[PDB]
Design a protein around this nucleic acid. Structure first.
Length: 280
RNA sequence: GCGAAUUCGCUU
RNA sequence: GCGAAUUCGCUU
């Protein structure tokens, strides 16, 4: 049968007020980056009014708009699209129930005009960090080189712990006044370099690199109402753990960059809410 | 989120 | 299993 293609339009209509920005984040309008998500279906999606999702950056207005229809796709491309759909929900979001309509897929411009991002999907499948921690070989003669532009829109993972299910972080800041030789926040160790050497037996090949501020990527599943009522003892403990996660300062050399950009990840976490709303 | 200890509520 | 309180461990 022929295909329908919809764009999931996203616009930050009400940026988070200062008084609610408890984790003191930068705000990231989705409309500031062209790569986004769409839906490929064999059946038309009924017209649905615009509706909000409440993200870390504030209230985002969602609109489902027709981009293309009455076209065919080869089996090969449908298979690629299907794999990426499954990848989004199993490996990025780590879900089992995508909607808490048939295929979510990345779209991007070719020139201001949106179409299926086949190249991006291919790049993901080729990436050595698509599933887990990628192999590396930093030595004195082939040292780690810090490229600032590679961290400007990055999701990172520690390469040295949690092999089976790595923790993903947004890079929230680059601390150019810090190096691995800066003082360590805990007194049992003098420097970041010493900490990583003692606990993990990790050597660093680059002692001039900046250090990174991070923001955990984990998000609640239903974003259809605002986050903010009192908390239980469990929720407190959870909040405290997230707080400590976000106080961590990481060393770029000891992290791997995920192939999905931070700007797209921020849009991905909205998908379950959007699919839930559409099937209602 | 992954775990632990102690204590209390829901069933007849 | 559905909940609550108090306390401790894992990250930098």
């Amino acid at each position: 049968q022929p295909c329908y293609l919809y764009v999931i339009g996203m616009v930050l209509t009400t940026p988070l007020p200062d008084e609610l920005n408890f984790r003191r984040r930068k705000l990231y309008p989705p409309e500031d980056t062209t790569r986004c998500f769409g839906i490929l279906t064999a059946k038309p999606i009924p017209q649905i009014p615009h509706f909000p999702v409440y993200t870390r950056s504030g209230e985002v207005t969602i609109s489902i708009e027709l981009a293309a229809s009455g076209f065919m796709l080869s089996l090969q491309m449908l298979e690629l699209i299907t794999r990426l759909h499954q990848y989004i929900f199993s490996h990025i979001l780590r879900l089992e129930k995508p909607a808490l309509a048939y295929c979510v897929l990345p779209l991007n411009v070719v020139s201001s005009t949106l179409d299926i991002d086949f190249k991006f999907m291919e790049d993901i499948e080729k990436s050595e960090a698509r599933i887990g921690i990628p192999s590396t070989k930093y030595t004195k003669e082939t040292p780690f080189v810090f490229k600032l532009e590679d961290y400007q829109d990055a999701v990172i993972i520690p390469r040295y712990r949690n092999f089976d299910q790595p923790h993903r972080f947004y890079v929230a800041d680059v601390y150019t006044d810090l190096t691995p030789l800066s003082k360590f926040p805990s007194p049992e160790y003098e420097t970041f370099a010493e900490y990583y050497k003692t606990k993990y037996n990790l050597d660093l090949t680059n002692l001039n690199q900046p250090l990174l501020d991070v923001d955990h990527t984990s998000s609640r599943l239903n974003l259809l109402t605002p986050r903010h009522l009192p908390l239980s003892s469990a929720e407190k403990r959870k909040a405290k753990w997230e707080s400590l996660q976000n106080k961590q300062i990481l060393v770029p050399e000891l992290c791997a960059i995920h192939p999905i950009p931070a700007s797209l990840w921020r849009k991905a976490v909205c998908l379950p809410s959007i699919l839930y709303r559409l099937h209602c």
